[PDB]
């Protein structure tokens, strides 16, 4: 991947996380389980839908009959007409085929980017109070309950609050 996350340092997907494209797997006391970050997911859904709609709605074609009829003494112009039809065919075929090959890669880089961003948003908050145990996981150096997890996902993680405890468990 272009951003390293999907099929990278995060090697597999979570069937458990049926509620969205990107999310979190939290584990403390109290409980655990998968939960999708609906925010980055809804944004992703909106933007990708606008991508698909962009490729479709931008066509809007002219009214044309295409078919032409030429007699046995009109072979040159019949062959010109054919060159036009085939010319358009090679153009649209090549263009459609590449559009799909190119944009498909872009769409993948985009999902990869959304994940990498999520992961870095967490990493920058925690810092010391947690261990980057690879595979996309963070092991906390302090008890992190529901409202703590929710805090990290919500970007309002209170580093000072757990600073003291974190250092000790190190």
């Amino acid at each position: 991947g272009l951003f390293g996350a999907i099929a990278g340092f995060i090697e597999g997907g979570w069937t458990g996380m049926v509620d969205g494209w990107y999310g979190y797997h939290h584990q403390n006391e109290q409980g655990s389980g998968y939960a999708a970050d609906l925010k980055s997911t809804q944004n992703a859904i909106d933007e990708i839908t606008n991508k698909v709609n962009s490729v479709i709605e931008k066509m809007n074609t002219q009214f044309t009959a295409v078919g032409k009829e030429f007699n046995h003494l009109e072979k040159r112009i019949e062959n010109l007409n054919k060159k036009v039809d085939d010319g358009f065919l090679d153009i649209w075929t090549y263009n459609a085929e590449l559009l799909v090959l190119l944009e498909n890669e872009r769409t993948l880089d985009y999902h990869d980017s959304n994940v990498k961003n999520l992961y870095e948003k967490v990493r920058s908050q925690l810092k010391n109070n947690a261990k980057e145990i690879g595979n996309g996981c963070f092991e906390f150096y302090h008890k992190c309950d529901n409202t703590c997890m929710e805090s990290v996902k919500n970007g309002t993680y209170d580093y000072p609050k757990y600073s003291e405890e974190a250092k000790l468990n190190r």
Partner: protein
């Protein structure tokens, strides 16, 4: 206490290609390629087409007895097995152009431009039939034209004009007959060395019979060439002949329409609506590309020879 970042995976088997790697299984995808059609010939702009059944455009516009047959149509349909056209062998001048120009009309009216009963008091307008254009097995002729012959061993010079008092173009068709021998020429028209002149304010051409024995076609050694022109509103067209003229009887006032097409298919016509027509069926799609048929009529998606154009929406599926 652990917190992990991750991405969704599902039971998806969909695959898409990317510039960097082929056959990538993704969670969600969508097709940009329309490959479905309804196997019907439908209406365009809400207007049904003109189906000519077993007859072609030539046999229909000329009034071939085999085609007994609206006032509008978005396009014309001819069955691939449409022989019924020029029953009397000859050359149909600018036939392709006429077909094209009749492909779509917003208004169309057949009227009797030269009434049969009162137009030719010095010529015979009843013996003009042939075994080449049979009606119910009997010698007949085009319903829209009249094959004039001498009356009582005399073919006077004829001169007849029509003024287009309609508020639109009038399609006028006529013919020029070429007997195979001087004996037939004299038997039909008497005068031997004849001429036909047709001219409007735009159009002007002189015709001279070309007498020779040509290869039998539908048992006829002679030939009959067919001509046509559109007479502009207010314009006049004049016919003048000493023989060999196949005069107009019915002409067509019409309002020609932008520019449509002619589909030659066995595909049945139904009571459906479409914006894009194919000889194989109609395309009801919002997609930008199509692989049903290159020869379409209407507002259609682009034709490609792709078999698959699958757009990735979701991400790579790795259930593991």
């Amino acid at each position: 206490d652990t917190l992990c970042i991750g991405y969704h995976a599902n039971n998806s088997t969909d695959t898409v290609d990317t510039v960097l790697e082929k056959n990538v299984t993704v969670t969600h995808s969508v097709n940009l390629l329309e490959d479905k059609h309804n196997g019907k010939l439908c209406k365009l702009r809400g207007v049904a087409p003109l189906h000519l059944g077993k007859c072609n455009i030539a046999g229909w516009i000329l009034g071939n007895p085999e085609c007994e047959s609206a006032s509008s149509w978005s396009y014309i349909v001819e069955t691939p097995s449409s022989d019924n056209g020029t029953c009397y062998p000859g050359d149909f001048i600018d036939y392709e152009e006429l077909r094209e120009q009749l492909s779509s009309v917003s208004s169309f009216e057949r009227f009797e431009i030269f009434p049969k009963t009162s137009s030719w008091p010095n010529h015979d307008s009843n013996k003009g039939v042939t075994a080449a254009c049979p009606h119910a097995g009997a010698k007949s002729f085009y319903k829209n034209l009249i094959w004039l012959v001498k009356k009582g061993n005399s073919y006077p010079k004829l001169s007849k004009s029509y003024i287009n008092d309609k508020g639109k173009e009038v399609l006028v068709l006529w013919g020029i007959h070429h007997p195979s021998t001087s004996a037939d020429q004299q038997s039909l028209y008497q005068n031997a060395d004849t001429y036909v002149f047709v001219c409007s304010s735009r159009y002007s051409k002189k015709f001279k019979p070309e007498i020779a024995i040509c290869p039998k076609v539908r048992d006829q050694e002679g030939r009959m060439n067919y001509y046509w022109t559109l007479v502009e509103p207010g314009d006049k067209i004049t016919f003048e002949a000493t023989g060999n003229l196949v005069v107009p009887r019915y002409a067509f006032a019409m309002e020609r329409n932008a520019g449509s097409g002619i589909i030659i298919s066995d595909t049945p016509v139904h009571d459906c609506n479409t914006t894009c027509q194919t000889p194989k069926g109609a395309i009801n799609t919002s997609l930008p590309f199509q692989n049903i048929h290159p020869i379409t009529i209407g507002k259609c998606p682009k034709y490609v020879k792709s078999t698959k154009l699958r757009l990735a929406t979701g991400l790579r599926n790795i259930p593991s």
